[PDB]
């Protein structure tokens, strides 16, 4: 289904956003 | 229908947010 | 109905967010 | 329902994070 | 009910991330 | 299913992020 595919893409983007947030936090902490 | 179309547009925006986040994280690495 | 309308409004909100973070990614170039 | 409500709350928080990112990037340039 | 629960937890965390970014932006303004 | 598991993982990652930026925000005060 198109909706199921969109959810998969949204999950993948959330994980990429999470990883970028963690890199930014490391930049401020260091 | 219209619900599937809205989810495709949500997914598109999420992909663009994830890309921007990766760009921002890369700027904090120089 | 209003289920469709809710996801349509979510699509608009995240398009606004995508615009915002594209501008932030550009602002870090300067 | 509950998923749409959570998307809306996430969108509102993203917008506040975007505004703060803008002020931070602007600070780095004067 | 798992996906709705996960979305509620994501929304909770985003509210807290937003609070922190607003504090950080205020620090850069003073 | 799998998509529920993906969002459960995302929830755990963003709670870690909220924790990280709580510390960063309070470090910007002294």
Numbering used by the authors:
A (entry chain A), B (entry chain B), C (entry chain C), D (entry chain D), E (entry chain E), F (entry chain F): 1 to 30
Excerpt from the publication:
However, the large Phe residues are accommodated through a half-heptad translation along the superhelical axis between the two helical sheets, resulting in 21 screw symmetry. Moreover, the KIH analysis revealed that helices with the same sequence participate in different quaternary arrangements.
CCs are quaternary structures comprising two or more α-helices supercoiled around each other with cyclic (Cn) or dihedral (Dn) symmetry.
